[PDB]
RNA sequence: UGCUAGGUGACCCAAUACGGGCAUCGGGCAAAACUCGCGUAGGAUUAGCGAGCUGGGUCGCUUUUUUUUUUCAGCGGCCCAUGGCUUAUCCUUAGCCUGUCUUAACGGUACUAGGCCACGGUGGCACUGAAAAGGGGCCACGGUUCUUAUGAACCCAGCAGUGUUGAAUUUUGGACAAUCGCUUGAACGGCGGAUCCAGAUGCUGCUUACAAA
């Protein structure tokens, strides 16, 4: 019933020792019996795929945190620090938000890395929940200011508001703050949607707000009559 | 006649019956079954197809079956 | 990508939705050696009441803090309101 | 090539007059051992097969030993029920080593039938405590139960009402069996055969009314009663099925009296009546004599049944049996006039 | 058998469920009516044979 | 064992309200498979059976499961009793019976439809299935094609159709509508060279000048 869920990674850590060890008795007996009958050409299919089952690479004994500090090396490029993680999360280690995510965060240098790291964090509190949003939520503003993507951040509203994960209103407040010194109000009102969006007050909008009609005066007047249209639509 | 023989083999049921679809001058179907085996086949679970089961339910010796669930436009020039 | 989501409440796009019916997941009971075929264990509510105690499945609230019914209406305003931009 | 060593390894265990050290394999399955002993006739034979293949015997195993030993019992002339006492009491550590760890209910149910046809008419006995565990043990899951026949049910109830003394009748293993086997049964009553609704009827007779809980035990075998003796008595009469045989209702209606004895109008007696009294000489006389019993003990009259066992009661012979038979139902009948 | 209407497929589903409705009724009457013919038939057969019809035609035999 | 109806569901699907699949149980009747009693072409220019040729014991002969009672065989290994048959073996012809034709009948012999068996180019063998293979699996043979020759692909005694031989042998037709089968819980659904309809072609039963209502 419940005693299920625990027996099942219990039982699952037992049948993948078991996998692993007869996967590997069998993988060492096929080829004792390949240059006999040929038998390479279907014993790829076992070296390959019984190898490959649910996952390959164990569950590390220490948690592979040394393999973690391989892999948050500050010399260690950020593709192969990524592919690192994520076969560490295809190995299921619950992972520490600040100690690991935040140093590879720090460590992608384009937009696209950014949002391959949420794909990573998403995952990340994905095995976590199998959450802790606020501190990532501060570096990755952080590297919004450093590295002027905004698009990301509404990426991560996006990907907490799809299984109902709430940040701060502080945190809403921040990116919000830093989608008016980046400069894109189409990402700030977004924001300021999505931050409606769970339920949360509308985050005192005459200061943040005032801040983003003031940036969307500076910018184009047009979508500025949009928001002071849609600013009692909000209710502010 | 089970599953395996086929529609003119020699059968160890004794008859499909007295019968003739043939409309016949008025009281246009044929006379029906003979009997008292029929009673038998049917309670020792041999199955009816489709149209002995509407011609038994249409002779009132048996219920009827409601066969249409819906209605698409059948094309009556296939023959 | 997986089930677990003990006690959700949700509906399919297919059913009539003021027929009422909606499951309340009791576990999952998964074969995670073989990935296609899954179980949801469920206690299904029919028309308000329990019967037993795919594509399509559709994202309804989820009471308990979280995103509240009305509030889910005053909110789908909102993101009508965020469409109308 | 090695056949040699595999027969030293049979010399060592059983001496050299014996034919299964030929046949011997260390590989057998659990098939061909059914099969084995399925083909012995003495007790010599399966003491050879017990201690060549104690290491390999599941619960199959020893239903057929079972089995074979009452084959021997009605058709091996040198029988010794001393060697065949301590040889059931060898058997029970293999059962509590491996039948109690894996035991299907059909297993199960196949070796306490067994056992009961050991100790039935044509005293070996076993410990009680192994039969209620072993009752228990083939009963712990539901799932199993609910797909289980209506003939391994009452063969169980067969099983439970021959092995056990009436001292531990109220033991609350047996009730807890009695339980889960109404919770069972009750759904699927018009699954059973008369047969195994005859021995369903007898066995919760002589269990059920042997402090809330107990009564409440009593009051669910008593709904249990009510029901099951009211489908026998829709099942009697209705040509369309099986019609039950005239024992089989006369000897639940005996159940019904013995339970209504204990706990102190139906159609069953009405019918069980008119199948008597159709076909008393298919009777046996002390089954219908313990349904006189049971008008006695209604108070109900039934005429034609009553004349009928009045003819039946002269045609007895003198002798100490039929002269109990006679006394008891000269008492019933002066109990009913 | 429908997806993602509301409109007319309640039509559709309410007569598969009154085929299938008024198919089952036609069982439970056909279940009925052999249970019936069987009552007959083992009625006629359990009506006249086993009698002592047969040990009189025997012994009249056997006193010949 | 296989079908159909029932009754069950801590299961799955459908449901503005309820039925299907899916698992299990049991009632009905049922197939299947084996056994034996008899029948059966001629040949002495086949007279002994080159063989376990028959029987008894011992095992192996791959499941318990409702009350007094219940579970084949040389089929293989071993001993053993030394017998078993003598139209026995061996040869060659041949699917067998009902049929059809005739005879007045008894009989004698090419078909109709249909009963059963056998076989699928030849031979050996296995999986699964309760039971085994005509367009299922593996190997060897014999054909037919192609290779840069190393090897692969295929097997109409299914339909039409081609070729030899023959005195002689048919359309490379249409269609699932009717059955009947297989399948599918919508849908008069899907498919079937079974069949049903049309052709060519012996036999037959039965009409036939047009005009006009």
């Known amino acids: 019933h419940l005693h299920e869920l625990q027996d099942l990674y219990r039982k699952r850590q037992k049948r993948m020792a078991a996998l692993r060890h007869g996967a590997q008795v069998e993988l060492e007996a096929r080829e004792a019996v390949a240059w006999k009958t040929g038998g390479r050409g279907r014993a790829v299919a076992a070296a390959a795929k019984a190898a490959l089952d649910a996952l390959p690479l164990p569950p590390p004994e220490d948690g592979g945190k040394a393999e973690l500090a391989a892999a948050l090396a500050a010399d260690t490029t950020f593709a192969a620090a990524h592919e690192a993680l994520t076969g560490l999360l295809r190995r299921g280690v619950v992972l520490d938000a600040a100690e690991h995510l935040a140093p590879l965060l720090r460590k992608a240098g384009d937009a696209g890395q950014l949002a391959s790291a949420l794909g990573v964090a998403a995952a990340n509190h994905l095995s976590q929940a199998a959450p802790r949003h606020g501190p990532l939520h501060a570096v990755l503003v952080q590297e919004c200011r450093r590295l002027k993507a905004a698009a990301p951040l509404v990426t991560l509203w996006e990907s907490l508001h799809e299984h109902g994960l709430a940040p701060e209103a502080a945190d809403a407040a921040a990116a919000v703050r830093a989608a008016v010194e980046l400069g894109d109000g189409g990402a700030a009102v977004r924001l300021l949607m999505l931050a409606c969006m769970y339920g949360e007050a509308p985050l005192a909008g005459a200061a943040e707000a005032g801040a983003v009609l003031q940036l969307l005066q500076q910018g184009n007047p047009d979508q500025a009559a949009q928001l002071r249209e849609l600013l009692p639509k909000l209710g502010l | 006649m089970e599953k395996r023989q086929a529609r003119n083999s020699g059968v160890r049921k004794e008859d499909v019956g007295w019968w003739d679809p043939n409309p016949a001058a008025d009281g246009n179907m044929h006379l029906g079954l003979n009997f008292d085996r029929l009673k038998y086949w049917l309670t020792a679970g041999a199955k009816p197809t489709d149209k002995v089961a509407e011609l038994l339910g249409h002779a009132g010796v048996l219920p009827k079956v409601p066969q249409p669930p819906h209605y698409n436009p059948r094309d009556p020039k296939d023959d | 990508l997986p089930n677990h989501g003990v006690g959700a409440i949700v509906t399919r796009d297919t059913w009539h939705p003021e027929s009422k019916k909606y499951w309340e997941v009791v576990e999952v009971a998964p074969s995670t050696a073989d990935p296609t075929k899954l179980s949801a264990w469920g206690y299904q509510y029919f028309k308000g009441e329990r019967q037993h105690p795919k594509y399509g499945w559709l994202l309804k609230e989820q009471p308990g803090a979280g995103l509240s019914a009305a509030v889910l209406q005053q909110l789908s305003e909102r993101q009508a309101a965020a469409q109308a931009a | ?337 | 058998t429908s997806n993602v209407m509301d409109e007319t497929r309640t039509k559709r589903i309410i007569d598969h469920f009154a085929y299938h409705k008024a198919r089952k009724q036609y069982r439970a009457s056909l279940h009925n009516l052999y249970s019936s013919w069987r009552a007959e038939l083992v009625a006629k057969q359990l009506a006249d044979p086993g009698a002592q019809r047969r040990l009189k035609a025997e012994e009249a035999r056997e006193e010949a």
């Open chain 4, 1 to 337: 090539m090695r056949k040699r060593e595999l027969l030293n390894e049979a010399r060592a265990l059983v001496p050299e007059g014996s034919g299964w050290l030929e046949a011997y394999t260390r590989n057998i399955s659990p098939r061909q051992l059914t099969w084995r002993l399925g083909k012995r006739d003495s007790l010599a034979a399966m003491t050879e097969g017990w201690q060549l293949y104690q290491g390999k015997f599941d619960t199959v195993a020893m239903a057929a030993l079972l089995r074979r030993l009452r084959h021997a019992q009605l058709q091996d002339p040198g029988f010794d029920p001393l060697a065949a006492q301590r040889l059931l009491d060898d058997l029970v550590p293999r059962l509590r080593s491996v039948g109690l760890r894996f035991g299907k209910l059909r297993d199960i149910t196949a070796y306490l039938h067994a056992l009961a046809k050991l100790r039935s008419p044509a005293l070996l006995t076993q410990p009680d405590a192994l039969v209620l565990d072993l009752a228990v043990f083939a009963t712990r899951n539901r799932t199993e139960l609910l797909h289980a026949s209506p003939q391994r049910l009452a063969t169980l109830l067969w099983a439970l009402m021959r092995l056990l003394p009436p001292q531990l009748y109220g033991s609350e293993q047996l009730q807890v069996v009695l339980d889960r086997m109404a919770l069972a049964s009750l759904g699927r009553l018009q699954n059973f055969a008369p047969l195994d609704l005859r021995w369903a009827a007898l066995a919760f007779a002589t269990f059920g009314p042997h402090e809330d809980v107990t009564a409440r035990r009593q009051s669910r075998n008593a709904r249990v009663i009510k029901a099951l003796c009211d489908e026998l008595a829709a099942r009697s009469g209705n040509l369309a099925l099986p019609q039950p045989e005239p024992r089989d209702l006369a000897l639940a209606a005996h159940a019904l009296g013995l339970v209504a004895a204990a706990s102190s109008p139906p159609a069953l007696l009405v019918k069980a009546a008119g199948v008597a009294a159709r076909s008393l000489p298919a009777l046996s006389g002390e089954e219908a004599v313990g349904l006189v019993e049971t008008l006695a003990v209604w108070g109900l009259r039934q005429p034609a049944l009553l004349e009928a066992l009045r003819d039946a009661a002269g045609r007895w012979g003198e002798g100490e049996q039929a002269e109990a038979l006679r006394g008891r139902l000269q008492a019933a009948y002066t109990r009913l006039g």
